From Swiss-Prot, chain A:
Protein name: Proteasome subunit beta type-6
Domain of life assignment: Eukaryota
Subunit and partners: The 26S proteasome consists of a 20S proteasome core and two 19S regulatory subunits. The 20S proteasome core is composed of 28 subunits that are arranged in four stacked rings, resulting in a barrel-shaped structure. The two end rings are each formed by seven alpha subunits, and the two central rings are each formed by seven beta subunits. The catalytic chamber with the active sites is on the inside of the barrel.
Signal peptide stretch: none
Segment of the intact protein contained: 20 to 130 of 241
Function of the molecule: Non-catalytic component of the proteasome which degrades poly-ubiquitinated proteins in the cytoplasm and in the nucleus. It is essential for the regulated turnover of proteins and for the removal of misfolded proteins. The proteasome is a multicatalytic proteinase complex that is characterized by its ability to cleave peptides with Arg, Phe, Tyr, Leu, and Glu adjacent to the leaving group at neutral or slightly basic pH. It has an ATP-dependent proteolytic activity.
Family: Belongs to the peptidase T1B family.
Cellular compartment(s): Cytoplasm; Nucleus
Swiss-Prot record, chain B:
Main location: cytoplasm
Protein's name according to its UniProt entry: Proteasome subunit alpha type-2
One Pfam family recorded for the sequence: Proteasome
Chain positions of cross-link Glycyl lysine isopeptide (Lys-Gly) (interchain with G-Cter in ubiquitin): 108
Organism whose genome encodes this protein: Saccharomyces cerevisiae (strain ATCC 204508 / S288c)
Transport among keywords: no
UniProtKB/Swiss-Prot annotation, chain D:
Organism: Saccharomyces cerevisiae (strain ATCC 204508 / S288c) (Baker's yeast)
Protein encoded by which gene: PRE1
Protein's name according to its UniProt entry: Proteasome subunit beta type-4
Cellular component terms per the entry's GO annotation: cytosol; endoplasmic reticulum membrane; nucleus; proteasome complex; proteasome core complex, beta-subunit complex
Signal peptide: none
Source superkingdom: Eukaryota
UniProt keyword terms in alphabetical order: Acetylation, Cytoplasm, Nucleus, Phosphoprotein, Proteasome
General remark: Present with 21800 molecules/cell in log phase SD medium.
GO process annotations (BP): proteasomal ubiquitin-independent protein catabolic process; proteasome-mediated ubiquitin-dependent protein catabolic process
Main location: cytoplasm
Annotated Gene3D superfamilies: Glutamine Phosphoribosylpyrophosphate, subunit 1, domain 1
Job of this protein: Non-catalytic component of the proteasome which degrades poly-ubiquitinated proteins in the cytoplasm and in the nucleus. It is essential for the regulated turnover of proteins and for the removal of misfolded proteins. The proteasome is a multicatalytic proteinase complex that is characterized by its ability to cleave peptides with Arg, Phe, Tyr, Leu, and Glu adjacent to the leaving group at neutral or slightly basic pH. It has an ATP-dependent proteolytic activity. This subunit has a chymotrypsin-like activity.
From Swiss-Prot, chain G:
Protein role: The proteasome degrades poly-ubiquitinated proteins in the cytoplasm and in the nucleus. It is essential for the regulated turnover of proteins and for the removal of misfolded proteins. The proteasome is a multicatalytic proteinase complex that is characterized by its ability to cleave peptides with Arg, Phe, Tyr, Leu, and Glu adjacent to the leaving group at neutral or slightly basic pH. It has an ATP-dependent proteolytic activity.
Modified residues (Phosphoserine): 11
Assembly and oligomerization: The 26S proteasome consists of a 20S proteasome core and two 19S regulatory subunits. The 20S proteasome core is composed of 28 subunits that are arranged in four stacked rings, resulting in a barrel-shaped structure. The two end rings are each formed by seven alpha subunits, and the two central rings are each formed by seven beta subunits. The catalytic chamber with the active sites is on the inside of the barrel.
Record's subcellular location: Cytoplasm; Nucleus
A Pfam family reported for this protein in Swiss-Prot or TrEMBL: Proteasome_A_N
GO cellular component terms listed in the entry, alphabetical order: nucleus; proteasome complex; proteasome core complex, alpha-subunit complex; proteasome storage granule
Cross-link Glycyl lysine isopeptide (Lys-Gly) (interchain with G-Cter in ubiquitin) placement: 188
Keywords: Cytoplasm, Isopeptide bond, Nucleus, Phosphoprotein, Proteasome, Ubl conjugation
Family, as annotated: Belongs to the peptidase T1A family.
TM region positions: none
Organism: Saccharomyces cerevisiae (strain ATCC 204508 / S288c) (Baker's yeast)
Other remarks on this protein: Present with 7210 molecules/cell in log phase SD medium.
Length: 111, 250, 240, 195, 241, 244, 231, 235, 243
């Protein structure tokens, strides 16, 4: 039977300071016991000073990042170029994820 | 695109007339005469075969049509409208009756279904009424022989005998003088041929006249043997030769 | 599906189909609502060109929407049944989800919304009906009387009338109804309602219907004799 | 849910329904009323799947109340029971059926007679002198077969009912936290507070 | 008078849109003719190519509906091709559904029923065409069946259609009065084609070159159209007698 | 587009009337008269057939009086074809109720639903209304014997005695004159026939131009019987009252 | 006359009056100008107010980082069409990782407008658009008409008195086409162009609207004090 | 007849232009924007003295930071308000923030042209949408059935609009206080109204950043009416 | 009367006036032609230069369908684009199911049936274009012209637009003078001449020439635009003939 999920490995890490924040992630991408790439980035600048990583199943991860990046673009179009605050981004991402509640994005997301 | 005509094309005028139904009846008046006579042991329905050209083969155009083995139909008015009504009538006898009860519908109920179809063309969106009046003759076990007229409005009436179309006024008067409640089927056929000659102008023979009966069961026309309860169709179309035989002793 | 825009604007900015629906209301039998200090009374005209009627079974002019709210109307009788049915369904639906019966304002707002929807939907004509909706909110003793009309607008009234010759009875109510002192009792409220109809009706026989609504689902319809006593009493005081 | 009982006597129908609502290893409530008044002289008790029970009961209640307002008239117990049966008979072939069993106790004012109907989630209806749903019936039916008489009073019916609850409290595995008892007669529906 | 714009009845019980669709039939100014032999059915039609820039091979009003059925149209080419595509689709579906080739008369009835619907339903106009279907049916033999915008249809011993149809019709009538039979008593289709052209020449009073005509022939198990040289071969045979 | 040919069947006149409903009522006023009279022990339905021909089959015929269920019947005035559409709907509705509640449908409930269908055709859909007026005669255990009428508008009312179709104005005046509340069925039968005989557009009222029916409790004990009169029975009742 | 009831009807001379009436709504609209060089493309728009208490109706809309337009006529119709362009640009990016060619953008608008001119019930769009963009084949300027006709130009103008600017640009063609690598000068030429369409009114700070896109410049709009430089 | 979405020869939509005539028949509504807040005032215009005027609801809350006044066929506004409220609350659910006043107005205006042969006709009501957000501060918008919306410093709509607008042209300046705006709405309403202005036939409201959208009591407005009459007599 | 107010209505003649009114819109358009040659077809069109501001070579009017068919039209340009969009859908579904690229006669009927369908109902408008199109398939070269009614035929040469009569006369001379056939490269030159000669009927505004061609030998059976040296050579040939 076809299994629509896979595991691409890797790990990510976010820490917040007083006037800064970091989002780190390794660049290794794997399936089973094989290395697919030694340098495949999964931490992205999404605009409006928001960085994002969706780690787990890379296909779902890329799809989510792609949809959120697009959500930022349309937020500008619809609300007079207003900056998307980190709290508003967070709430928006919840709805992106929960929209597929019964066929989930197989990722841990950090912004 | 798509049928944007979702509104009625037949509507009430200030005087209360339904214009399109009246005009449909006018088309029936222009149509060639057809008639029906009910005897004690059968029914006869007849009409003239108005040929469009002498090069046309009028045998290929059937004005009298079998609906069920015991029910037949003839009309006056627009031929194409009649043809599609016969198709629908044959189908509805199966879908709304035979496929449910395992037997053919009684005459009155098949007539009722055809009447419904014609009524809907009077009220539904984007259609004109049918431009025909039907005469439906038939037999069933519990009602015996019957004869019905169906008009463009969807109204139907049972008749002892009647005529519709071109010379219906004169033909009805002729039938009133001749009809009694003791007529045998052969007497009714004789009167049918007499009545029709008045309205026919040109040739009057078995090739220009179409005539069918609802009478006794015809085991020879069944196509098989072995089932006692199945005894054959009561509907039979008289042949060109069979008509000419009766035109000599006229 | 039939799509035609039947209710549309004209050059002068009127929606004629909505305005012609008001004419149907003007043709309908007169209906009046008067609210007292502790009650609301709904009075209705019944035309007397119809003798040989069976009043047991003939649809009553005042309808219960719930045990605590009533609806009367003026205009097309057939149209009103559709509004009443929808209102009754919404009443039960409200009890089901909110666990509390409708307020009179809410029920009115719903009925008015339905009427409005039929003024800018394709393939439909507006309702030829104006309604008077009266009752008491759950656990409340303040009387409520509302009016709706084909356009969809609604409002609250101390007293109001609709239907044929309603302008005459509105005139009467405008000088005979004191805002500072509404009819203090049931008797006073019924009398003022009967008086107002007697300006327009004809005979006070089987031409007037009266329904009294009191707090906590206390609704009762008066009989002929009970109403006739008000008619008899009013005429004797008039000869003065 | 779990225990719902019904007894029809000379002049009334008596319904007894357990008060416990249990989920997992916790009794969440011990005062739950597993019943809805459909009309002034008609009462319905219910048991079955969590959520389904109340949702179905209130849906039926809304429909009967709607009917009452429309016609200014009370449906007979027989008419209400047939409406309820049909809804369950529809439900059993739906994508997700209502898993609810009901008893309908009513007093027919036109006949001046009490009536008790037992309907399961499949839409299986029967009129009975006494009824039960679930495992309760395995004790109460035989008990009532012995002690029930058709001409009993409401008081005799309540004593007969006490005998059923006592037997269930002795032999049933679960603590159902007693019952709420309600009487349906010519004067409508009332609750017995001390049982 | 909107009763003349859509297919509803006029006060005198007429359908003017159907009547005006009949007048569109002659818009091409072309006459067609169909006759039956013993073994075959021949249909001929005039071929007028006025523009010198036209590719004459693409100018045709005869269509091969199925292997066995042919159809000639009298009316504008857009409506003609509309009818042809539907007839082809209907004949193909019939074979798939019922396991045998659609008879000429059954296809005629079906196309006539479709035409009837346009006379009753308002949103669809009638097609301004008359369709003449020909074949050698495996049960009925040589067959000619003709459809019009009214939804009328009937079988023919022979037939003609077009502006000068009446002249051709009477010419054929007078021949069958003389011969006393329902068909052309001839063995080969070649001579039945010759008969068809001969009697069209007499009725219309015009001579034809190889490019003035169009010929379709139906035999058992196939219907085919003739090339210019096949017709020329046929014209030579008539001239040498 | 198709807007050009739309009659707009569901609109108001400037006066606030529905054109198509008014014109449908005008149509119905030319249909054969039908009368309903409610007595204390039953109901009478009487209707005049539209100008009959001598070759019409009279016994196997139904034009005016139809059975909805065992307890309810209707008299028709208007287009028969339109009426049969509505009659079949009403018949199905009665069976739906019986299936749902295991009780025969109360008369008013059936009348309201049929009247609601008519109403719909006047408010939405762009279709012509049904050109039919009904007289409903029926019994139930709530109100006993009941007469109702409905018309193309979808408005219905209850009556002690009523007429529909042709000459209702004259017919109603005659009914209003001779009707009283303590009346019996056999008296109502006579009143119905006497009224038709005076309001008819024909030369003389005969058995072949009439349909007749009664709904009595004249069965055996506490149950209702529908009697659709046969031709010979109408001939006898016409002689018994001395009209022929 | 008798042939202007809807878009589905041709006149006896083969005209579509509803489309022509839609074209008329553009003529009543406030003037807007478009022009380009080989490196940049510039939109200039005169904004219109209801009165002195109101704001000035915004004429320019961004479609992508590399594309945008200006409007003249029914503003809600411009919002619908610009939204469609935003989606089409976006589809090209998400699916093909490809910036939508300004030419395809024109073809897509043509076909969307056309469908509204051949069917019953609908109406033509009542707005004209000037689309500018920078793609893989350099700078572009398009003129959209709601008839469906889209035209690529070096420069143009639409709206009331647009003929003045259109004549000016026709004279200035050889000059402004070679303003390469100089944004402020290309704008100056566009501001001088729109000045040929002014009557009794002059360009103020809350009246003028300018947009620019080019080789190393995303589509950006200038309003308020940011256009004071050019008056 | 003719199509609902038909253009006139002058390039305007017949139905939209006709709905604008309906709005001219409506009761007057005035809005004034200041740096201390936005004031919204309306003429109630009771058709009869028996009608309880406090049930006339022509000023309406959309959210805590956005209010709305109406003029014309006021029954048409109900679904517009319902959409506005849902749009406002939905945006808060999706983005954990207040929605911009302009974005709200644009959302309401998207409904406007969704008519044809969607609803059967345009709305017969104009809206004054007033609110505050962090980006653009206090704002007033005029939303028309054409789908067009203009931002205004001050705006009047309804029967007395052209006279009231000319008055607002003279009176408005960029330093008006909230109290000054309140009195100015009352003054201009009293001028254009038929019946004499009092607390029962006119209603005031405002939106401030601090307290949000508030409809004033009849007692509060009555004192502002008394304060206004005294100030006009004082010179 | 009023028979001309609604599409699909027959007049008492048996005519559809709305289609005839669409033909008037075609006659108003610019000139376009088609020339059939030895092993292919050549298409050319007149592009009126309304203003100096039009970018030369950048408002392309000839359109390709699939990889082997060319289409050009006169009249309402948007209507023509709608027809080509449909043509591309028709050609794609043919190739999807049957593998082989759509034959030209097959493609011609697909457009024909679609255009004819827009004369059947009053809820649609007829097409305001006559379309000249064709290409090379397994049976060689084919040229077609399709009109608003849905009527189409095969052509040796075709012309439509404001200068159709001038172009037709010039086309007839080529057919008479070359019975054996015209070569592809010759047909390109002749196409230029005919557009220049047909421009006399539209001579207020000067114009821009656009040519395309399909040839079994010259373009390998694929549709290509004529550009650069071959275009200028064809323009010069045309310029020499008018003087
Ligand atoms: Cl068929």
């Amino acid at each position: 039977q076809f299994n629509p999920y896979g595991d691409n490995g890797g790990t990510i890490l976010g820490i917040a300071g007083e006037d800064f924040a970091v989002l780190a992630g390794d660049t290794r991408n794997i399936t089973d016991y094989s290395i697919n790439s030694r340098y495949e980035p999964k931490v992205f600048d999404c605009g409006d000073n928001i960085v994002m990583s969706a780690n787990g199943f890379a296909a779902d991860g890329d799809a989510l990042v792609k949809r959120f990046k697009n959500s930022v673009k349309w937020y500008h179009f619809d609300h007079n170029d207003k900056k998307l605050s980190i709290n508003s981004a967070a709430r928006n991402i919840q709805h992106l994820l929960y929209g597929k509640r019964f066929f989930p994005y197989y990722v841990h997301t950090i912004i | 695109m798509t049928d944007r005509y979702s509104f009625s094309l037949t509507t009430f005028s200030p005087s209360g007339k339904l214009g399109q139904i009246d005009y449909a009846l006018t088309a029936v008046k222009q149509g060639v005469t057809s008639l029906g006579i009910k005897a004690t042991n059968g029914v006869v329905i007849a009409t003239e075969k108005k040929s469009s050209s002498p090069l046309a083969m009028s045998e290929t155009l059937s004005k009298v049509s079998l609906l069920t083995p015991d029910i037949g139909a003839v009309y006056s008015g627009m031929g194409p409208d009649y043809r599609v009504l016969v198709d629908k009538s044959r189908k509805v006898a199966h879908t709304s009756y035979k496929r449910i009860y395992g037997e053919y519908p009684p005459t009155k109920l098949l007539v009722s279904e055809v009447a419904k179809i014609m009524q809907e063309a009077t009220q539904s969106g984007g259609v004109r009424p049918f431009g025909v009046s039907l005469l439906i003759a038939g037999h069933d076990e519990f009602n015996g022989f019957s004869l019905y007229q169906v008009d463009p409005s969807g109204s139907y009436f049972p008749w002892k005998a009647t005529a519709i179309g071109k010379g219906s006024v004169a033909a009805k008067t002729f039938l009133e003088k001749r009809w009694n409640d003791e007529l045998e089927l052969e007497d009714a056929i004789h009167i049918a041929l007499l009545t029709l000659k008045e309205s026919v102008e040109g040739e009057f023979n078995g090739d220009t006249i179409e005539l069918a009966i609802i009478g006794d069961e015809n085991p020879d026309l069944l196509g098989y043997t072995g089932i006692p309860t199945d005894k054959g169709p009561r509907f039979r179309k008289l042949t060109s030769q069979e008509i000419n035989d009766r035109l000599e002793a006229l | 599906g039939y799509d035609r825009a039947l209710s549309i604007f004209s050059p002068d900015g009127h929606i004629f189909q909505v305005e012609y629906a008001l004419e149907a209301v003007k043709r309908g039998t007169c209906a009046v609502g008067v609210k007292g200090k502790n009650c609301v009374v709904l009075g209705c005209e019944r035309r007397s060109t119809l003798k040989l009627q069976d009043t047991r079974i003939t649809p009553s002019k005042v309808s219960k929407i719930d045990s605590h709210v009533v609806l009367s109307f003026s205009g097309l009788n057939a149209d009103s049944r559709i509004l009443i049915e929808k209102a009754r369904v919404e009443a039960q639906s409200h009890r089901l989800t909110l666990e509390d019966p409708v307020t009179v304002e809410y029920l009115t707002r719903y009925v008015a919304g339905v009427q409005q929807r039929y003024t800018q939907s394709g393939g439909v004509r507006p309702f030829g009906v104006s309604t008077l909706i009266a009752g008491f909110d759950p656990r409340d003793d303040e009387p409520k009387l509302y009016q709706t009309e084909p356009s969809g607008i609604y409002s609250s009234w101390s007293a109001q009338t609709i239907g044929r010759n309603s302008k005459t009875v509105r005139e009467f109510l405008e000088k005979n109804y004191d805002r500072k002192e509404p009819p203090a009792t049931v008797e006073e409220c019924v009398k003022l309602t009967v008086r107002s109809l007697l300006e327009v009706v004809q005979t006070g026989a089987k031409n007037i219907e009266i329904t009294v609504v009191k707090p906590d689902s206390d609704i009762v319809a008066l009989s002929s004799e009970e109403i006739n006593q008000y008619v008899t009493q009013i005429e004797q005081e008039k000869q003065e | 849910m779990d225990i719902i009982l019904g007894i029809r006597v000379q002049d009334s129908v008596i319904l007894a329904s357990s008060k416990a609502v249990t989920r997992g290893i916790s009794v969440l409530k011990d005062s739950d009323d597993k019943t809805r008044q459909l009309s002034p002289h008609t009462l319905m008790s219910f048991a079955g799947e969590a959520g389904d029970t109340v949702q179905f009961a209130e849906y039926i209640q809304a429909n009967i109340q709607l009917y009452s307002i429309r016609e200014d008239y009370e449906l007979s117990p027989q008419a209400v029971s047939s409406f309820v049966r049909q809804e369950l008979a529809k439900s059993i072939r739906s994508r997700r059926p209502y898993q609810v069993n009901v008893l309908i106790g009513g007093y027919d004012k036109k006949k001046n007679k009490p009536e008790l109907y037992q309907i399961d989630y499949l839409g299986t209806k029967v009129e009975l002198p006494y009824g039960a749903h679930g495992y309760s019936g395995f004790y109460t039916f035989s008990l009532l077969d012995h002690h029930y008489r058709p001409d009993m009073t409401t008081e005799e019916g309540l004593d007969l009912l006490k005998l059923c609850v006592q037997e269930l409290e002795k032999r049933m595995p679960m603590d159902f936290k007693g019952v709420i008892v309600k009487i349906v007669d010519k004067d409508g529906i009332r609750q017995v507070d001390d049982f | 008078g909107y009763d003349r714009h859509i297919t509803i009845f006029s006060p005198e019980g007429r359908l003017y849109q159907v009547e005006y669709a009949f007048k569109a039939t002659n818009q091409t100014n072309i006459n067609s003719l169909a006759v039956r032999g013993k073994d075959c059915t021949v249909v001929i039609s005039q071929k007028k190519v006025p523009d010198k820039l036209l590719d004459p091979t693409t100018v045709s009003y005869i269509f091969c509906i199925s292997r066995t059925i042919g159809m000639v149209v009298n009316g504008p080419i857009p409506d003609a091709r509309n009818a042809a595509l539907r007839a082809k689709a209907e004949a193909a579906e019939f074979r798939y559904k019922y396991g045998y080739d659609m008879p000429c008369d059954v296809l005629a009835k079906r196309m006539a029923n479709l035409s009837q619907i346009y006379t009753q339903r308002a949103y669809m106009r009638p097609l301004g065409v008359i369709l003449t279907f020909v074949s050698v049916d495996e049960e009925l033999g040589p067959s000619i069946y003709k459809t019009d915008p009214a939804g009328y249809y009937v079988g023919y011993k022979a037939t003609a259609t077009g502006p000068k149809q009446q002249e051709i019709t009477t010419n054929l009538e007078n021949h069958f009065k003389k011969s006393k039979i329902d068909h052309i008593n001839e063995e080969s289709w070649e001579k039945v084609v010759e008969f068809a052209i001969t009697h069209m020449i007499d009725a219309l009073g015009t001579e034809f070159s190889k490019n003035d005509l169009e010929v379709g022939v139906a035999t058992k198990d196939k219907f085919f159209t003739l090339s210019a040289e096949n017709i020329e071969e046929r014209l030579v045979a008539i001239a040498e007698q | 587009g198709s807007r050009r040919y739309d009659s707009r069947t569901t609109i108001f006149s400037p006066e606030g009337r529905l054109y198509q409903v008014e014109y449908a009522l005008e149509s119905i006023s030319h249909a054969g008269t039908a009368i309903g009279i409610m007595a204390s022990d039953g109901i009478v339905l009487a209707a005049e057939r539209k100008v009959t021909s001598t070759l019409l089959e009279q016994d196997t015929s139904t034009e005016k009086l139809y059975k909805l269920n065992d307890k309810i019947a209707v008299a028709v005035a208007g287009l028969t074809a339109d009426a049969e559409i509505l009659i079949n709907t009403a018949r199905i509705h009665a069976q739906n109720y019986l299936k749902t509640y295991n009780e025969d449908i109360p008369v008013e409930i059936l009348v309201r639903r049929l009247s609601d269908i008519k109403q719909g055709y006047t408010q939405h859909g762009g279709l012509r209304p049904f050109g039919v007026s009904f007289i409903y005669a029926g019994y139930d255990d709530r109100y006993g014997y009941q007469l109702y009428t409905s018309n193309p508008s979808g408005n219905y009312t209850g009556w002690k005695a009523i007429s529909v179709g042709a000459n209702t104005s004259a017919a109603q005046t005659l009914l209003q004159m001779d009707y009283k509340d303590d009346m019996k069925v056999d008296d109502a039968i006579e009143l119905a026939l006497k009224t038709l005989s005076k309001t008819t557009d024909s030369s003389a009222l005969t058995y072949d131009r009439l349909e007749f029916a009664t709904i009595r409790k004249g069965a055996n004990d506490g149950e209702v019987y529908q009697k659709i009169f046969k031709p010979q029975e109408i001939k006898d009742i016409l002689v018994k009252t001395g009209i022929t | 006359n008798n042939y202007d009831g809807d878009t589905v009807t041709f006149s006896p001379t083969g005209r579509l009056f509803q489309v022509e009436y839609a074209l008329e709504a553009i003529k009543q609209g406030s003037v807007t100008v478009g022009l380009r060089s080989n490196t940049h493309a510039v939109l200039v728009a005169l904004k219109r107010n209801a009165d002195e208490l109101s704001s000035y109706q915004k004429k320019i809309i961004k479609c992508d980082e590399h594309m945008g337009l200006s409007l003249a006529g029914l503003a809600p119709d411009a919002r619908v069409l610009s939204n469609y362009l935003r989606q089409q640009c976006n589809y090209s990016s998400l699916v093909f990782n490809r910036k939508l060619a300004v030419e395809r953008a024109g073809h897509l608008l043509c076909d969307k407008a056309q469908k509204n001119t051949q069917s019953y019930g609908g109406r033509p769009y009542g707005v004209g658009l000037l689309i500018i963009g920078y793609d893989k084949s350099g700078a572009h300027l398009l003129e959209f008409q709601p008839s469906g006709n889209v035209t690529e130009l070096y420069g143009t103008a639409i709206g009331a008195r647009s003929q003045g600017a259109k004549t000016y640009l026709e004279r200035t063609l050889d000059t402004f086409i070679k303003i390469d690598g100089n944004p402020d000068e290309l704008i100056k030429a566009g501001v001088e162009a729109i000045s040929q369409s002014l009557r009794d009114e002059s360009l103020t700070v809350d009246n003028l609207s300018i947009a620019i896109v080019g080789k190393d410049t995303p589509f950006t709009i200038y309003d308020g004090e940011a256009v004071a430089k050019y008056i | 007849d003719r199509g609902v979405s038909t253009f006139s020869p002058e390039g305007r939509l017949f139905q939209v232009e006709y709905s604008l005539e309906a709005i001219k028949l409506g009761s007057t509504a005035i809005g004034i924007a200041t740096k201390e807040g936005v004031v919204l005032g309306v003429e109630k215009r009771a058709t009869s003295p028996l009608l309880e005027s406090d049930s006339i609801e022509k000023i309406v809350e959309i959210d805590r930071h956005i209010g709305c006044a109406m003029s014309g066929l006021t029954a048409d506004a109900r679904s517009m308000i319902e959409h506005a409220r849902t749009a406002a609350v939905t945006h808060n659910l999706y983005y954990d923030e207040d929605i911009n006043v302009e974005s709200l107005t644009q959302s309401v205006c998207d409904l406007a042209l969704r008519f044809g042969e969607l609803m059967s006709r345009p709305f017969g009501v104009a809206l004054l949408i007033a609110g505050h957000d962090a980006d653009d501060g206090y704002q007033l918008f005029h939303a028309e059935p054409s789908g067009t919306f203009y931002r205004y410093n001050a705006k009047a709509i309804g029967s007395g609009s052209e006279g009231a607008q000319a008055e607002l042209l003279n009176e408005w300046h960029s330093s008006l206080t909230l109290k000054e705006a309140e009195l100015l709405v009352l003054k201009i309403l009293k001028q254009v109204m038929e019946e004499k202005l009092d607390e029962n036939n006119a209603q005031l409201s405002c939106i401030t950043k601090q307290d949000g959208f508030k409809i004033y009591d009849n007692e509060k407005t009555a004192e502002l009416i008394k304060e206004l009459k005294e100030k006009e007599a004082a010179e | 009367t009023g028979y001309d107010l609604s599409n699909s209505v027959f007049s008492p003649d048996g005519r559809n006036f709305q289609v005839e009114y669409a033909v008037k819109a075609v006659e108003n358009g610019t000139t376009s032609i088609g020339i059939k040659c030895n092993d292919g077809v050549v298409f050319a069109v007149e592009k009126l230069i309304t203003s100096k501001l039009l970018v030369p070579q950048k408002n392309v009017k000839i359109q390709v369908v699939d990889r082997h068919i060319g289409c050009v039209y006169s009249g309402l340009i948007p209507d023509g684009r709608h027809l080509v969009n449909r043509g591309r859908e028709e050609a794609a579904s043919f190739k999807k199911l049957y593998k082989t690229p759509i034959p030209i006669p097959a493609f011609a009927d697909r457009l024909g049936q679609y255009v004819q369908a827009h004369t059947l109902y009053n809820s649609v408008r007829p097409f305001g274009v006559s379309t000249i199109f064709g290409g090379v398939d397994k049976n060689g070269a084919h040229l077609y012209m399709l009109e608003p009614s849905g009527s189409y035929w095969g052509y040796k040469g075709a012309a439509t637009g404001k200068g159709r009569q001038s172009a037709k006369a010039e086309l007839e001379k080529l057919v008479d003078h070359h019975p054996e056939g015209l070569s592809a490269r010759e047909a390109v030159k002749q196409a230029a001449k005919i557009i220049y000669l047909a421009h006399e009927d539209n001579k207020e505004k000067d114009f821009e020439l656009e040519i395309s061609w399909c040839s079994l030998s010259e373009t390998n059976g694929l549709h290509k635009f004529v550009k650069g040296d071959l275009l200028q050579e064809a323009i010069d040939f045309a310029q020499k003939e008018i003087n």
